[PDB]
């Protein structure tokens, strides 16, 4: 039958919606070899390309809707017996340049999640592929070349019998896409950094293992005759000195079977090794339950007398560095029933009550 | 009267003697690239101050950038000086695109040029240089030297205006460390 065709509701420009099933649009697979190492890239493609060959309820909705205000949710599903574990990271980056680094230091930066399959049955997060707006489209992420990387941060504590596969479930959710924008105000309530402070390795034994991580986070990460850098980190290096409350995310990257009690404290490079009075400093005792894999550390304003430098000259020694360090110390002893080292991921989530001082002319190297 | 600190980032030396033909070099003000015209043997370097570390990693940008262009600088009798510097701001390297700004410098010995430009794009004011999306492009600073035997080098210094904002991360390759030739620093001497 004929009718007023122009009055038909064929202009439904609204977003993807319905049940969670209705909002699914793509699925991907990550092969987790039973013999992989740290820094071993598992998946590396374009976010857009996820939809190729997909046949889900919102696949065509996703690929035709011109504007989406909801976020992209991704769920990882996978597991392994409690007698093992590893550390996987999923991250979204805005783009790349030729021969880009695949080191976690730069990958994590923008947006990511980290989990250990030996404790979590699944893990998920939501994100805004348009970091400076509240809307996006499939066409936009296609031409802006949004990238996605899955990387093995830490290898298996105990190798699984066969290779296993992690599966990612891609869907759209009604969470509003708020932007994440960095700016130059000297005072900021919340400055997210997602800085990979480092990968700590504590081998099994009865020795007194001490690890030092500098809080002079500017300058990027060291390498050969080069360094790695990401936007969040370089942004904070714009200031000469800074202070605030530090929020760290600590991740157990080894199996539940590998256990150790770790002390966290703020001190200086003047503090030597084999000094059995570390607990005289104000500190936190972190123990990990078998289920537990993540711990938040908070270092309030009271932990610092003054602000400190964003950078130091690379030639500076510990005995001539008044900038504070985050110490990670084996309070008791690293052990387990199986072989394997205790890996502990440390990431600076961000700074609360960020106060930046002056302007940094810059130092070419880091540490 | 300068106040806030500018940071050096791109330098480029004109070709060595006996090269005397008119030449030029293009500076990518956002990606930190130095591309000499043709096959002229220019000696180029890029430094790594916070500003460059930001420009080369920030996917989306918005705001005002202040630029200082310094021109060196050679033992040349003032009376015999005839070097001229022509610079252009461009939104592309295509012949079809027109210059966004032109400056002409003809000072003997050395020269200083202060100017500024805005980065602004379609994404709520943010721009993603050279992205296929919306045909966004970077900014180029084209420098022409009429006498490369009198003009030794160009120096680009940059500063972020307080209204400068960034978002998103680009996965860059490792950045090589800096590390002379012409005695323009005590260290070089």
Numbering used by the authors:
A (entry chain B): 1 to 367
B (entry chain A): 6 to 184, 188 to 197
Please share excerpts from the published article on this structure:
CPMV has an icosahedral capsid structure, which is ~30 nm in diameter and is formed from 60 copies each of a Large (L) and Small (S) coat protein. Crystallographic structures are available for three Comoviruses: CPMV, BPMV and red clover mottle virus.
Until now there has been no individual structural analysis of CPMV-T and the RNA packaged into CPMV-M has not been visualised. The cryo-EM structures are of sufficient resolution to visualise the individual amino acid side chains and both structures reveal differences between the CPMV particles. The resolution of the map permits the side chains of the large amino acids to be visualised. The second major point of interest in the previous cryo-EM structures of CPMV, was the presence of additional density representing part of the 24 amino acid, C terminal extension to the S subunit in the eVLP structure. However, the eVLP retains the C terminal segment better than WT CPMV particles that contain RNA (CPMV-B/M), suggesting an allosteric effect of genomic RNA in accelerating polypeptide backbone cleavage.
